[PDB]
Amino acid sequence: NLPEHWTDMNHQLFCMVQLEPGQSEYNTIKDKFTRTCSSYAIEKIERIQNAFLWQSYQVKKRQMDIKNDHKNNERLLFHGTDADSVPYVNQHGFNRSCAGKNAVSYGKGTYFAVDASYSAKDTYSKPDSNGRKHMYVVRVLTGVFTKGRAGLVTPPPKNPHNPTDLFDSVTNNTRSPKLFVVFFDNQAYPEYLITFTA
Amino acid sequence: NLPEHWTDMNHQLFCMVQLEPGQSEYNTIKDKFTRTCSSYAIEKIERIQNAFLWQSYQVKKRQMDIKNDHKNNERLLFHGTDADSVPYVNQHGFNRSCNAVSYGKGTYFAVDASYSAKDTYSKPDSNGRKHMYVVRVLTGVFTKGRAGLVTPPPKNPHNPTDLFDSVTNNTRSPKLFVVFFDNQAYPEYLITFTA
Numbered sequence: 001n002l003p004e005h006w007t008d009m010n011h012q013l014f015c016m017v018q019l020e021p022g023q024s025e026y027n028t029i030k031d032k033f034t035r036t037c038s039s040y041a042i043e044k045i046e047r048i049q050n051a052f053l054w055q056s057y058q059v060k061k062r063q064m065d066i067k068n069d070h071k072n073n074e075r076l077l078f079h080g081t082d083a084d085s086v087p088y089v090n091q092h093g094f095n096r097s098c099a100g101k102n103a104v105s106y107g108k109g110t111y112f113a114v115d116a117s118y119s120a121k122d123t124y125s126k127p128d129s130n131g132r133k134h135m136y137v138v139r140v141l142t143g144v145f146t147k148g149r150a151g152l153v154t155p156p157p158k159n160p161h162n163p164t165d166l167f168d169s170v171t172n173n174t175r176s177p178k179l180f181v182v183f184f185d186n187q188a189y190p191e192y193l194i195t196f197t198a
Numbered sequence: 199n200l201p202e203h204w205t206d207m208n209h210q211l212f213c214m215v216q217l218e219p220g221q222s223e224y225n226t227i228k229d230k231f232t233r234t235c236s237s238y239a240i241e242k243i244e245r246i247q248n249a250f251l252w253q254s255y256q257v258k259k260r261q262m263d264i265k266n267d268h269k270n271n272e273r274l275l276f277h278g279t280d281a282d283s284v285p286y287v288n289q290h291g292f293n294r295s296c297n298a299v300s301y302g303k304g305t306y307f308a309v310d311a312s313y314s315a316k317d318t319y320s321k322p323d324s325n326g327r328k329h330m331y332v333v334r335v336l337t338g339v340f341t342k343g344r345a346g347l348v349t350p351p352p353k354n355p356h357n358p359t360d361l362f363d364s365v366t367n368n369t370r371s372p373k374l375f376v377v378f379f380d381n382q383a384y385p386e387y388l389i390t391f392t393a
């Protein structure tokens with residue numbers, strides 16, 4: 001069920017595809033980034049074609065679309081990371097067990113930002129030895145969310161008398177969400193890698 | 199693609215089905231337990247019919263069968279748990295974020311029911327009832343674990359992203375397996391028993 005606009009991968013399971021400025025695909029990601037990161041400049045944007053991560057993510061999306069009934073369950077969010085983590089994330093996606101404690105913790109999970117400006121902080125997108133910073137653009141199954149708390153290892157129950165029926169994600173603020181935390185594998189697909197510099 | 203031996207769920211996606219004693223499915227699961235736990239009393243065995251967990255597990259199985267270029271990635275293993283964790287596991291399966299973790303920070307599965315039957319794992323409830331899962335685990339290609347692992351090690355440190363599927367206490371004669379990812383383990387049966 002691989003998307004028809006992906007490059008042919010020749011029975012291979014992984015490929016990074018360099019995008020061309022002037023194409024709508026490149027320009028919409030550039031605009032989404034520059035909305036809050038006008039001071040930085042983009043070196044390049046790569047489409048991540050990971051067949052296995054895509055399959056698992058799409059199975060979780062279809063399950064959450066069934067479970068939630070007519071919710072927009074998916075948001076396009078940002079995740080800054082260090083150069084050392086980029087090969088693992090490209091192949092294996094986002095592992096909560098590898099996640100750094102956030103300066104404002106709303107739970108022990110993987111953090112995704114609404115604003116590129118947040119992920120552009122040196123604390124998340126650490127400049128490598130050549131001054132390159134790295135930010136993923138990520139399909140995240142935010143589903144139905146509530147304000148998190150520092151102690152969470154899973155999203156909280158919607159109802160305390162039904163502890164197993166969980167929120168899909170948590171946020172910093174349900175009125176004005178600026179970040180989302182997810183606690184399960186295959187709940188985020190890294191779709192694009194932005195390489196950028198000051 | 200819901201298995202043959204599952205019974206009708208009336209268009210629902212989750213059911214716990216009590217097995218009939220004396221029929222093949224019950225007898226098969228009873229014998230796997232009684233191989234090392236003949237001194238315990240089985241109160242009941244339930245088949246876990248969780249369509250979402252099953253689907254995510256079968257996708258991983260298909261992926262691991264392609265990656266390893268053969269089948270034989272699956273083992274039937276035991277997991278003891280406290281009564282309060284049973285509803286979570288039935289619905290969401292096994293969560294590494296939730297005892298000793300000497301071979302890594304993953305979910306632990308025993309080759310022998312007798313290991314899972316220890317009170318430290320299958321903690322007796324108020325009434326003395328103990329709980330153990332029979333689990334389909336995608337052990338795949340495994341190596342020896344060690345303390346502090348958050349994922350299995352690489353097969354070759356010249357390709358750090360190509361990983362073993364699981365780790366064990368002992369590669370020649372394993373008695374436990376640790377997996378580090380959601381949906382590498384399907385809880386298939388729950389055994390309620392006493393000492």
Ligand SMILES: O=C1N=NC(=O)c2cc(OCc3cccc(Br)c3)ccc21
Binds near residue numbers: 300307
């Ligand atoms: O069935 C289980 N249910 N919950 C567990 O945490 C568990 C853990 C487990 O190995 C833990 C361990 C660690 C180091 C040395 C030795 Br020896 C054993 C085996 C079975 C189980």
